[PDB]
Amino acid sequence: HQSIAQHYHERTKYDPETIASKRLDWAKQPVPFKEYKIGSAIDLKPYLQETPDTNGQWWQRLSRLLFRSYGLTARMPSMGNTVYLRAAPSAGGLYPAEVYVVSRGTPLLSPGLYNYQCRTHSLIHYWESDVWQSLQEACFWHPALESTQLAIIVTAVFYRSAWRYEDRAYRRICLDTGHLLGNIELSAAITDYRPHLIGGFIDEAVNDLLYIDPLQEGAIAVLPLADLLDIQQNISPGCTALPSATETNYPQVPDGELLKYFHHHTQISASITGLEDKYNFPFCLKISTVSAPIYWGENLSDLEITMHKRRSTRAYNGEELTFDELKALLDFTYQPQNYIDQSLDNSPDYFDLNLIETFIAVCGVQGLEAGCYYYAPKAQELRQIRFKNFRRELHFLCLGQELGRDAAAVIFHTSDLKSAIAQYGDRVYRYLHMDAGHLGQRLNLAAIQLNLGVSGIGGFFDDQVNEVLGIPNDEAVIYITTLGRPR
């Protein structure tokens, strides 16, 4: 019998037979920022600067870490108003993620709870008390909390995405959040911090600790921030993910009620007690993807510029990528060990990349036949599984978007959901989508650094993808990332 994550997935697919048979409540379009009536505001803008104090140097690092992670980087006009685009992309420009900072209490940062205000690049200190032990208990005394003095917690304000995507919003929320997680690790590197990803925590406890309404908002990632300038905080990566239960006895949940049901049925509760790529394709054509690394400038200066200017490309011109360009994108995304000499982490935390497979539809990469390839990141190989021009198909698969038709290459992240659930329970659904978004952000940043076009695609004809591209039946497509040359 299917578990609730499989049911959720099935219920949120798009089907060409029914997509036409499926009105936004504008009176209700959410404002994607939180308001606080009580608390001290800490303005971070004075520290987002140039040159020419050790306390100021500390605030500059926190200010920059937050700004490069989730700061406002552009504005658009929209129905008589302005949408502010951010460092992290978001399905529909809806921004379900909220960033909090939790302080253990240091001589510079009072203890308690802080909300990151994108609009003003400030922190609102809305609760001053020592909350660290409560956070430790909620995360099963994770060792990363013992060494550190502050943590980011990322939550999702469900309605921000559900307003548009209804129950399908849970996929988009987790993807959006994964993109933000990718910025956090890169932004941290820039500022000599390392985040320690904690996906395994007692939801009830974390949500209580933040004083948020769990029907409207819920924590999905806890990230202690280790200060790499403190020898004592250069700690080993730890357990990034824990299992939830597997629920097979779910009731019939009406449309519109499934997203919250699913979030509340993927929680973790207090305890009662206490190296080969997956698909060998041995008789298929294999092509090495070994690449020289992307150069990010002195002291990651070009990574900073790229993070600031990064936008999702509206349209492609249909021109080709070079194979070197494709290899460089894959290298930065999947081979972080090749960036240690540029001060990036050789192994940034994910929940579990072993659960995610990568397939690439290639339509316009010079030196590569058009078709579908399995990407084997451990071996650093593309293995050709189909030989065909897939432009027309990809156009359809991406819900009719020209981005799919005109892309040079389209990267599909997939997962065998049954197997994933067997390991981490239904909560693995969160982990998969956050990991795919994290990979996605690395791909987006690499593309922009290389003067290429890129855009995620959240909605697609789920079942039809495998059929067209030759992706093994057991692999459910989780996310799509298009790559091309900008129009």
Give the C-alpha separation, 88 to 440, whole Å.
11
Q: How far is the CB of 311 from ligand FMN (least distance, A)?
A: 3
Q: How far is the CB of 302 from ligand FMN (least distance, A)?
A: 19
Q: E-strand spans in 16-121?
A: 40-43, 72-78, 81-86, 97-103, 112-117
Nearest to ligand FMN of 91, 259 (CB atom) = 91
Query: What pairs with residue 478 in β-bridges?
Result: none
- List binders of Cl ion among 102-131 (CB under 5 A): 127-128
Q: Which of 71, 224, 459, 484 binds ligand FMN (CB under 6 A)?
A: 459
Query: What pairs with residue 26 in β-bridges?
Result: none
Q: How many residues bind ligand FMN (CB under 6 A)?
A: 19
- List binders of ligand FMN among 153-192 (CB under 6 A): 172, 175-176, 179
Q: Which of 162, 160, 109 shows the shortest CA–CA distance to 131? A: 109
> Contact, 126 vs 38, CB < 8 A?
yes
Nearest to ligand FMN of 326, 436 (CB atom) = 436
Helix axis angle for 169-190 and 301-309, nearest 10°, is 150
Residue that the structure tokens 């990809």 belong to = 394
Quick one: what does residue 128 bind among Cl ion, ligand FMN, none, with the CB cut-off 5 to 8 Å set by partner type? Cl ion
Q: Which of 30, 39, 93, 238 binds ligand FMN (CB under 6 A)?
A: 93
Give the C-alpha separation, 279 to 357, whole Å.
9
> Contact, 140 vs 200, CB < 8 A?
yes
Q: Which of 32, 71, 89, 484 binds ligand FMN (CB under 6 A)?
A: 89
For the window 385-424, what string marks contact with ligand FMN as x by the rule CB under 6 A?
A: ----------------x-x---------------------
Quick one: what does residue 283 bind among Cl ion, ligand FMN, none, with the CB cut-off 5 to 8 Å set by partner type? Cl ion
The reply to whether 456 sits near ligand FMN by the rule CB under 6 A is yes
Q: How far is the CB of 453 from ligand FMN (least distance, A)?
A: 11
Q: How far is the CB of 221 from Cl ion (least distance, A)?
A: 24
Q: Which of 41, 185, 187, 59 shows the shortest CA–CA distance to 117? A: 41
Residue closest to ligand FMN (Cβ) = 89
Q: Which of 240, 139, 169 shows the shortest CA–CA distance to 199? A: 240
Nearest to ligand FMN of 312, 342 (CB atom) = 312
In this chain, which stretch among 14-22, 89-97, 379-387, 420-428 interacts with ligand FMN, using CB under 6 A?
A: 89-97
In this chain, which stretch among 151-159, 275-283, 285-293, 366-374 interacts with Cl ion, using CB under 5 A?
A: 275-283
> 293-329 in b/e burial notation, b at 16+ Cβ within 10 A?
bbebeeebeebbebbeebebbeebebebbebebbbbb
Task: Please report, in range form, the residues annotated as the binding site for FMN.
Answer: 90, 310-312, 401, 458
Q: Would you call 49 exposed, middle or buried from its count of C-beta atoms within 10 A (0-12, 13-18, 19+)?
A: exposed
Helix (H) or strand (E) holding 301: helix 301-309
Q: Which of 1, 236, 283, 341 binds Cl ion (CB under 5 A)?
A: 283
In this chain, which stretch among 246-254, 266-274, 415-423, 453-461 interacts with ligand FMN, using CB under 6 A?
A: 453-461
Give the C-alpha separation, 387 to 390, whole Å.
9
In this chain, which stretch among 63-71, 85-93, 149-157, 219-227 interacts with ligand FMN, using CB under 6 A?
A: 85-93
- List binders of ligand FMN among 288-327 (CB under 6 A): 311-312
Q: How many CB atoms lie within 10 A of CB 231?
A: 7
**Would you call the peptide bond into 224 cis, given omega within 30 degrees of 0 as the criterion?**
no
Give the C-alpha separation, 273 to 269, whole Å.
12
Quick one: what does residue 343 bind among ligand FMN, Cl ion, none, with the CB cut-off 5 to 8 Å set by partner type? none
Nearest to Cl ion of 127, 250 (CB atom) = 127
> 189-202 in b/e burial notation, b at 16+ Cβ within 10 A?
bbbebbbbbbbbbb
Quick one: what does residue 312 bind among Cl ion, ligand FMN, none, with the CB cut-off 5 to 8 Å set by partner type? ligand FMN
Q: Could you give the dihedral angle defined by the CA atoms of residues 414, 416, 421 and 422, in that order, rounded to the nearest 10 degrees?
A: -150
Residue that the structure tokens 């500390």 belong to = 58
Residues at the contact surface with Cl ion, assessed by CB under 5 A: 127-128, 281, 283-284
Residues at the contact surface with ligand FMN, assessed by CB under 6 A: 85-86, 89-91, 93, 172, 175-176, 179, 311-312, 401, 403, 455-459
